[model samples]
Target: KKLIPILEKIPEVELPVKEITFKEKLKWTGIVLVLYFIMGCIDVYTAGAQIPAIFEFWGRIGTLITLGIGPIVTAGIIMQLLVGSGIIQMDLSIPENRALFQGCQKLLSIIMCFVEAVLFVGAGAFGILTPLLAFLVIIQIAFGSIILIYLDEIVSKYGIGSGIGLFIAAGVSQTIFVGALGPEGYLWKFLNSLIQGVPNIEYIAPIIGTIIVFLMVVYAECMRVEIPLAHGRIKGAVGKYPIKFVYVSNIPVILAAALFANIQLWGLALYRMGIPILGHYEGGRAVDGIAYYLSTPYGLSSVISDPIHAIVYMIAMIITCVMFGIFWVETTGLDPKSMAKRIGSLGMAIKGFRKSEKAIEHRLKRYIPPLTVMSSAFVGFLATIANFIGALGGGTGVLLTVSIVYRMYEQLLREKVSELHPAIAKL
Candidate 1:
């Protein structure tokens, strides 16, 4: 049966009817960013909270931005899985069913918000706040998370880029800022040593690693393979279809991170229940189980104590990301067959192919699957390696930040060109 149909029938919020201008779009994006930043700053009764901050992997999963967009994102993932598995019979092709699907997702998002709040409060993550304080804390997180949902909705309906992308970029950017410049961080120490004329080799490696990650991200962003294409009706009109080096993008990595985070949460819960086989708790960190191995290893020190676990983690990340990469493409209609259907309708085809379903996917299957696996593995490895040096925002966070920012820049440039030239927007 469908999870929540009663609420699904209600109409969604209205968006701007008329086309918005470049300036207006910019305003909306900025407004969403401002609101996100504000929520991230305001903590909700965090006094004496001895929480391990397992939620802090992505960003400010501590303050008013406690949930970030996680609850909604997780709900969406679950809905997709349910629909794909045939347990849910909502066809997105039908408008009514599509609306119902969305409404059910909203209900799930609200449910997830509470589920996460309880994970922290009920688990004694917050060292036993008063009954009144605990109630207030849960309310603050739920309401603040709801605000985040609206902000994301506003961006998608009224702004340039998506709310999730904007928030991800913002969160990682903030973390990078702090990590690179924080008082006790290696970057700060490196700067201090250089300025004080007492250089320490200890700080040099991280400084270099940070620079390498910066350059690495830029190179990957610009790298891509392109295939030639032509209009079916118009004579001699031609262009290239670009497939980025990273192929699909940041989604697989984000989902993989979420997957790991859920494992950590489950491990925490199980550890409390006195089950060490699943995973064990150790001094505010997970240890000695599949859970510990799957989660990202903290720093260089972890490598010395348990290199086997570290190696296992790196390999697991690659495999998990690859599986998710394949699954996402098939489920999201990003596969060759899906593209063939669209391109066929648009009267476009690869330069030499007959434009048939088999013909198009034949050429695409050559590169897409391989590239998806490669790209996902590349990101996973990059995250694993950088985490050793403690890359800003963690490795996943840095990778996500760089990818999102570059895409945003490209999108902004695209809009600006459309505004100035007008012809491209028409095309």
Candidate 2:
């Protein structure tokens, strides 16, 4: 017997279950944005006493957002790879299977949360403290992540757009803000460091790179291929349906970031044990193995030292983004068949196309797949290059912010329209 049927029967919250108003959605969005920042502010190890300098006094080790969607994304990427490679058979078109898929992903994320929480405490993310203190740290981090899961759920079921994108973007925006403006921000410190005669002190490379990417992404977001659409119910009605340049949106890179971060986590955990193949990190740097190859070069010294690592990381990210992009297209209803069906249900037809569903699908088939692949790959490669050049907020982080902010802008526009004209909301 398949697990899909069994999982579907499991009691679950009927999603989009709570219809939130435009204001309510904003309220929740604001709620999450605030808590997300607060969590990062308060590190998870306050009970464990003052942390040691092993982590350079940075709040990075065992921070509130320590696990920050890492486990969930890891679980998702694993599942997507499994499903994409045909290892896990699934049909999203079937409601039961969709439910089963989501259930499994949730279960996997919870399991990962527990596992990562243990690993962090065990990996000495929190300073070497009493067993009691360490246990407390685990509980705090684990349950804290559960709260995060719930927040994501609420946002998805109630708020605008997706919580995943919102939180990821939120995090990235903060990082970018700090990277550009903080006391030690790349651009800010560049001037001070250059005067001090530091080696290759001008870190404006990333600053320039960030500006270029920000502008590029904004333009790409605005660029869309418009398909002439005619309303079936009203013969004279016509509209142009836009297929965005970023049809796959920020999802693919978000997944790619999670995968990369997970690898770093794995590298950190194994650093103490001196794992040779998966990775070899002495808690500071990736020195060897496939993990090292995946490691990104962040600064002038690192980037100039090994050119090959940069290339490998870029290729890996691009390929992964492409893979996830394909999955996003299918799951998010951007697949040609699904889009055609949606258009049909919405009482719309492509100009010069046969009225039949198959005919419309045939027309969409010409554009969707290739567009998805290129968009995902482009963002992934672009992000990797930015990171290679030491872009502010890292390449992946900047990309997440750009894509997410655009999505929120679009959502806000829709919400405003709905508020002003109720009839337009249905249309």
Candidate 3:
């Protein structure tokens, strides 16, 4: 009678009933990582053009991971917007509705896989190809992404942390590693120049930028506002609910970056169709229009070439990050109201405040809103700066990978502690 039921019948990994140990989780994570790298090494047979900037962080443009997590994230963005705006009639708190939502998202992700493939091909990302060849490539991409969908399921159910986060970290970290130390890396180039009786100091700039950004993020993670809470049932039982300084985390940047990528994509696609409304391109580069401003400048060369473009790009990133941060917080039940309700339901209340959700929510309202804006803006600003100086991975990529790795560390710690002390499973 419903699409959800039909979606359920599709192949999925069964959640394990047996207690999964830390070692087991590590094993699954390693297996998935190896599989991902193997897939990335298997290049697409179809002829290629330059890799799109959109695929920079999470994709191997010429390989099986060419689509990466784009379709999944795209579908998720659409679904969240629809549901959050009340266009979709459903209460996520209900288990049935939640399952339905997840199933529908999966289905949409599959659809997006095909749609995105067509867009990429049509946009000449794989160069001008015959209709038959394009279709074949489309099928290949769709299948690859479908396989990724299942891989994500496997990670979610069997492995450690989130599959999406793990993949992003893997891809970004690889980029960083190669960028910093590979044959074509900055350090390698610097050494080669020195041997040839030349001194180039510019190579040192980006490494500095990357280290500073890394440290900044690590420092930020330790900054949080701890709200003291009391258990209603247990006398003198107190706990601190630590609200992170970067409360919204990387979701806003992910959304903002994704938006910029789409703009570039659609702009190029439309221009190819003789509709230059988005922009005019000269030799596959934006010459002018909305797309030009949206295209983030990489390294000193591009920024010096177009200072205005760089400035506008930075401002746009900050604004979009703020916008998406607010949207994400509201829709994903991370807002003060929802959080208060959740805490209240768990029989916890802010210490020294009235024992009510409303009271707790009011107290939280003071911190979350300001923190969200400040943190999102700071992150957006940092990402642009990192990009400008040519961080090992792209700016957003580095930011994402750092956050993902940090979270994974926390998760690893939790897994180990819980395994060691079965008495305190909640910790």
lDDT of 1 by residue, 172-205 (tens): 7776666667656667788788999998776756
* Cα-based RMSD of candidate 2: 3.7
Best by TM-score: 3
Alpha-carbon shift of residue 25 in model 3 (angstroms): 0.9
Off by over 4 Å in 3: 47-59, 202-205, 230-240, 300-307, 335-348, 365-367
lDDT of the structure predicted as candidate 1: 0.71
Q: Kindly report the root-mean-square deviation of model 3 from the true structure over all alpha carbons.
A: 3.4
Q: In model 2, state the lDDT of residue 305.
A: 66
Off by over 4 Å in 1: 1-5, 9-11, 46-61, 84-91, 96-101, 182-187, 193-198, 203-205, 230-238, 247-249, 299-304, 335-346, 356-371, 420-427
lDDT of 3 at 382: 77
Error of 2 at 177 (Å): 2.8
TM-score of each: 0.85, 0.85, 0.87
Q: Which stretches of candidate 2 lie over 4 Å from their true place?
A: 1-19, 46-54, 57-59, 127-131, 183-209, 230-240, 247-249, 299-302, 329-333, 345-348, 421-426
Expressed as tens digits, the lDDT of each residue in 306-380 for candidate 2 is: 767777888888898888888775464366766667788876778765777887888788777788888888878
Q: For each candidate, how many residue pairs have backbone atoms clashing (under 3 Å)? A: 0, 0, 0
Q: What would the TM-score be for candidate 3 when compared with the true structure?
A: 0.87
Residue pairs whose backbone atoms clash in candidate 2: none
The CA lDDT of each predicted structure is 0.71, 0.72, 0.76
